[PDB]
């Protein structure tokens, strides 16, 4: 299908700079503008800019001219956006989106038209170092739910899969918690059949982007 | 500039629902390029109405959108307990650029209520070997989001090492929550049992786990 799939998370400094990519598939991306917006966690959506791929060609508001650099790499159908002077209002969830059809008669640059969107790119920015999480399994206790408890990281998020990807059904992800000590902390779980426990292998996927830790856990019944 | 919507809006099933966005001339009223989105929590934004009155795709009839001077308006008919979602507004600018509104928290009405499934887990082996040792109450499919826990070693309530979320919507329009007791092995052990109790208005459900 038509797909974003944008970076990884990331945890910066102020004053420091991001680069956030945004890798186009199942069309090409000079076909279409390409927008990028934020949203502050909680607050509402932000847009920050529109580029054309092929003239280079980018607007932005005022409130972002001097910061933002907007850039393409057409060999690679990706999309890239650079932030600087990065300030803690800067920390929010960053998508890019398709926008209109670039054509040479009709000018569609400034259409707030987006029918497709990237899953989004939490950057942090903070004083705090980044710390990554302790992975445990959550034994299972016709039906069972088995579990991942992703213990004290910073900063959000951690992605979770299972089986690598293969096991869809069934997950449900807990959002995390914010501990007194400044930390996250989440849990997954997985409801399969009792049957399959014993026979089917299940593992959790974690993955902290912004400490770059990826742990699989083979979650299984209890030592009994 | 910055558009103009209702923060929160409540409506309820059958009757129909409005939500405004007020905007410049130099905005809204100068164009015909009006976009309304709507988003669930945890995804990205979806558009549902283009170009003040046009329907993008995976869209009903529901949903239709209009345009008097500098206000932008979308209507609702019909509702769902689906269409419970944030919804915002959008349009070009004389400056070539794309201004959005603070977004509609709409909120739909006759939701019937729904029991917390919780799910507790004891410390596993590992983090045990870790030296620490931490119970997991995960809650589930509950409405209204409102929603209470109390630990408990053995008979006794406790207060120390909780930590809770607050309940937040899930995809089913439905509330989710967790709870964590962190305690030390030794703590683990000094007790017969440990139990995770959730009230949701007047009815409770509890769990429970022994360390043997």
């Known amino acids: 299908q038509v797909q974003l799939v944008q970076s990884g998370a990331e945890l910066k400094k102020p004053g420091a700079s991001v680069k956030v990519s945004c890798k186009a598939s199942?069309?090409?991306?000079?076909?279409?503008?390409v927008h990028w917006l934020r949203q502050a966690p909680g607050q509402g959506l932000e847009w920050v800019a529109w580029?054309?791929?092929?003239?280079?060609?980018?607007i932005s508001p005022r409130k972002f001219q001097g910061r933002v650099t907007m850039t393409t790499d057409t060999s690679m159908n990706v999309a890239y956006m650079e932030l600087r002077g990065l300030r803690s209002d800067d920390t929010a969830v960053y998508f890019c989106?398709?926008?209109?059809?670039?054509?040479?008669?009709?000018?569609?640059?400034?259409?707030?038209?987006?029918?497709?969107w990237g899953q989004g790119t939490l950057v942090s920015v903070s004083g705090a170092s980044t710390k990554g999480p302790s992975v445990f399994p959550l034994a299972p206790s016709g039906t069972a739910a088995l579990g991942c408890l992703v213990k004290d990281y910073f900063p959000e998020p951690v992605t979770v899969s299972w089986n690598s990807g293969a096991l869809t059904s069934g997950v449900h992800t807990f959002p995390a918690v914010l501990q007194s000590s400044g930390l996250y902390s989440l849990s997954s779980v997985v409801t399969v059949p009792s049957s399959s426990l014993g026979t089917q292998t299940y593992i959790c996927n974690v993955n902290h982007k912004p400490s770059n830790t990826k742990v699989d856990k083979r979650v299984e019944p209890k030592s009994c | 500039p910055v558009l103009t919507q209702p923060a929160s809006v409540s409506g309820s099933p059958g009757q129909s629902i409005t939500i405004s966005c007020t905007g410049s001339?130099?905005?809204?009223?100068?164009?015909?390029?009006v976009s309304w989105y709507q988003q669930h929590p945890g995804k990205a934004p979806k558009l549902m109405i283009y170009?003040?009155?046009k329907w993008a795709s995976g869209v009903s009839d529901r949903f239709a959108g209009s345009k008097s001077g500098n206000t932008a308006s979308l209507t609702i008919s019909r509702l769902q307990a689906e269409d419970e979602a944030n919804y915002f507004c959008?349009?070009?600018?004389?400056?070539?650029?794309?201004?959005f509104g603070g977004g509609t928290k709409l909120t739909v009405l006759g939701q019937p209520k729904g029991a917390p499934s919780v799910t507790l887990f004891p410390p596993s082996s590992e983090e045990l070997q870790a030296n620490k040792a931490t119970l997991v109450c995960l809650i589930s499919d509950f409405y209204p989001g409102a929603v209470t826990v109390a630990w408990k070693a053995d008979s006794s309530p406790v207060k120390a090492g909780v930590e809770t979320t607050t309940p937040s919507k899930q995809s089913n329009n439905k509330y989710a929550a967790s709870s964590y007791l962190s305690l030390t092995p030794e703590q683990w052990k000094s007790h017969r049992s440990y139990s995770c109790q959730v009230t949701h208005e007047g009815s409770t459900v509890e769990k429970t786990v022994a360390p043997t």
């Open positions: 989106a398709r926008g209109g059809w670039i054509s040479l008669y009709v000018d569609y640059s400034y259409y707030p038209n987006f029918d497709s």
């Open positions: 199942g069309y090409t991306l000079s076909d279409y503008y």
């Open positions: 580029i054309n791929p092929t003239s280079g060609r980018t």
């Open positions: 001339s130099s905005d809204v009223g100068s164009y015909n390029l």
């Open positions: 170009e003040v009155n």
């Open positions: 959008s349009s070009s600018t004389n400056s070539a650029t794309v201004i």
